[PDB]
Design a protein around this ligand. Structure first.
Ligand code: ADP
Lengths: 465, 461
């Protein structure tokens, strides 16, 4: 543990040039250094992947499935070692880190069976001496840009599927916890993956701009924050690339007047403080809002530049006219449960996401207004409605635009993301249900019609030297 | 006479801005068309927004039913329709009837879309928690259609979108809008509720209206590449789903070993006026021999059967050093040799019977040429070599490929964005892409939290 190496062309490269430091969130002490890569160091990876592609594309489906199956085993073998490397640079419960990797492995298990659903049809003499067939081909060299949370699972949600489909991959992970990701890359090479099929290149905005600029890379896949997502989406798409982009968002719960309050409070307390991501509670009518606050407050007492970040957030909230009902700042400098009431979508505390236990209550007069509020912003990947009315619930499920909906029940969607464009993937849905969307993003359909026009005779004079 | 809009189930007469529809075989104006303002569009939008909730909840089988009668009423009125196509677009009635036969195949596919749209139900997936999954319509959607194909391109959009349970605003071409409107009316005659399909005639104003309207959730366009890029970028910028096909150029590759009579036959089928007929506008020849030979054969056969725009096009071609081998100024029938991708005649898309030969030294160069531009929807390679053909099929990026055989792709289009649909593919193969464009997937989990007692005091009056 001194300097972390790139994984280009099957060998580990040491870059010395620009460099940042990876810290240990639970200690504070910088542990290692990471190389912010130049366009030359990226072009290496691109050339490596471009070179590996034709061989890999023609590798038999069953052989690709085989190398993935061993990759799954070698991950289930080295779990302890990996999980340690996650908790060390990200700082999270080893139990959480292990649960993340279990998900990554589910993604690898799904990828092993992608070759099966990718077989196409053949027809001899669809017309006179004309054969026809259809295939699903890989698109070429593709790249994935991964976030800080989930250095294990988010890459394993991208590249195994893309490689199973027969592409080659350049992975540019987060600078802040890149060791765990790189280990998993190496294990894939150890499982049997040819050189150049997966490459790992560490870096920052430079590295990413490199991939956005490179005309060889055909598809670009990103999960992180909403500004960076919009960037990569628009700038990628305008250069003919396929772009899949999940950007951070806010999930909303709606409370109708008839909501069973103990049930809603249970969901909100698990989601905002206590598993689902919810950051805004839209209340229809003032009664249910006043009542919700009455119940929330007791239960929330029941439980350096970042210090200035949160104080700034809260302070702006008060400044713009929100009611700060529970201020979670305290000692043991932690941020406990914070509750804001009387929040509006023009406030900064609604528009800006803040890390940690913060709920905003937004008061609204009708269900239509609540649904319009949720639909008109960068809507997330989960939403709830709490009500006893059947007609309300049916309408909410019909007109809300969020993909997963919970009626009096929270959803297994632990982080909120908005999905850009038409190349849409779900991160937290059932893999078997949303996997085809991944497969379609990493493949192109091809439809061939073929005829070999005839000769009258086939004497040696009709061929070459 | 004057052509009426079809908003909210009734025919409206607009008088305001107006253009003239000509009878383009016999270049002489036959009718007038109303270029609509934002108010006349907002009428349609409001009509469609109103019709949506009822239509969305109409049973699958009832939607299938109205589509099935729509198919019959088209097969009933074919003669009348085809006449109206040939009259304002100007094309052989046999072609116009073949177009409508395709439109009807689109309607037949839409009738069966309700079946593939059923989802799952599971009682107690968790303790007293039900779960289900559904494919819902998205709302009010709009389609903007081109001059070529006033019958089939709309029937490729709205029947499927309506079968999925949306409502539709159709803004057809100003230049041949009679035939499209007739088919709209027949749909109403088949039983379609008022407001579910609306037809609003217009131009850039009308289109900008739909691009601006926040009620319309998806926008579907087929036409020229500049207008396509416009609608794509500006539509996606406003949160809409946009499906866009923009005019392009299909390329044929000739290897040295190509059977020339076979290639010439395919290239010569690719005809322009005013089951496998193909659009090809560029013939990439590998090596000079096959190119010289191709020219030798093409010239005699080019005695076949906007005008001011393309004198400029041809003139620029000569100016930049292309060899003008057959000059079609007058009936058309133009051939250019020694064309390069830096010329304007390669970059700009051209009205009419124009073929450009591009000489290249390797197959790799030919494939790179085709791949590096806004590639079309069809391509051919002519060769006897198996390895060449396999490689071409592997590395070319065009979706449909013909090896020594032309493809049934009569117009070239490039597809923008991630909402991609094929216009000329097998409907059963590319139909799901349409279905996905006009629907949104939902996963619902539901629980009704219990009460301890259910006396009348626990409910409302
Ligand atoms: N300004 C930027 N432009 C382009 N890419 C960036 C930028 N900032 C960060 N990235 C890259 O995107 C990922 C981080 O995006 P971000 O939204 O900051 O995720 P997170 O903050 O959750 O780690 C990293 O992989 C990083 O390399």
């Amino acid at each position: 543990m001194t300097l972390i190496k790139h994984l280009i062309g099957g060998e580990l490269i040491a870059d010395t040039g620009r460099t940042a430091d990876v810290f240990n969130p639970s200690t504070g002490e910088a542990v290692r250094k990471v190389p912010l890569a130049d366009r030359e160091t990226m072009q290496q990876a691109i050339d490596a992947a471009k070179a590996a592609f034709p061989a890999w594309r023609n590798t038999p489906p069953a052989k690709r499935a085989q190398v993935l199956f061993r990759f799954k085993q070698l991950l289930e073998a080295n779990e302890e070692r990996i999980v340690k490397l996650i908790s060390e640079e990200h700082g999270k419960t080893i139990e959480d880190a292990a649960g993340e990797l279990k998900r990554g492995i589910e993604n690898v298990e799904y990828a092993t069976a992608a070759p099966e659903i990718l077989k196409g049809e053949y027809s001899r003499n669809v017309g006179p001496n004309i054969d026809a067939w259809s295939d699903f081909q890989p698109i070429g060299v593709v790249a994935g840009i991964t976030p800080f949370n989930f250095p294990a699972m988010v890459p394993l949600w991208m590249y195994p599927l893309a490689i199973a489909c027969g592409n080659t991959f350049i992975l540019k992970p987060s600078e802040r916890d890149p060791s765990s990701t790189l280990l998993i890359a190496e294990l894939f090479h150890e499982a049997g993956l040819p050189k150049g099929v997966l490459n790992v290149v560490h870096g920052d905005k430079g590295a990413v701009d490199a991939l956005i600029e490179a005309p060889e890379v055909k598809a670009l896949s990103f999960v992180g924050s909403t500004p960076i997502a919009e960037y990569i989406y628009s700038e990628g798409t305008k250069r003919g690339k396929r772009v899949q982009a999940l950007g951070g968002a806010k999930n909303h719960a709606v409370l109708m007047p008839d909501a069973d309050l103990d049930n809603a409070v249970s969901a909100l307390m698990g989601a905002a403080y206590g598993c689902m991501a919810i950051s805004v509670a839209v209340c229809v009518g003032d009664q249910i809002a006043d009542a919700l606050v009455q119940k929330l407050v007791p239960q929330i007492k029941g439980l350096g530049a970042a210090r200035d970040k949160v104080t700034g957030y809260i302070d702006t909230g008060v400044a713009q006219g929100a009611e700060l009902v529970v201020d979670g700042r305290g000692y043991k400098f932690f941020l406990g449960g914070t509750l804001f009431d009387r929040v509006t979508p023009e406030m900064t505390i609604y528009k800006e996401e803040i890390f940690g236990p913060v709920l905003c209550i937004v008061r609204v007069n009708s269900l239509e207004e609540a649904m319009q509020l949720i639909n008109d912003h960068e809507y997330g990947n989960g939403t709830c409605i709490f009500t006893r009315d059947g007609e309300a619930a049916r309408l909410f499920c019909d007109e809300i635009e969020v993909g997963m909906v919970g009626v009096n029940v929270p959803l297994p969607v632990p982080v909120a993301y908005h999905s850009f464009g038409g190349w849409k993937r779900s991160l937290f849905g059932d893999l078997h249900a949303y996997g085809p969307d991944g497969v379609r993003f990493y493949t192109k359909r091809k439809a061939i019609t073929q005829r070999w026009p005839q000769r009258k005779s086939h004497e040696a004079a009709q061929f070459a030297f």
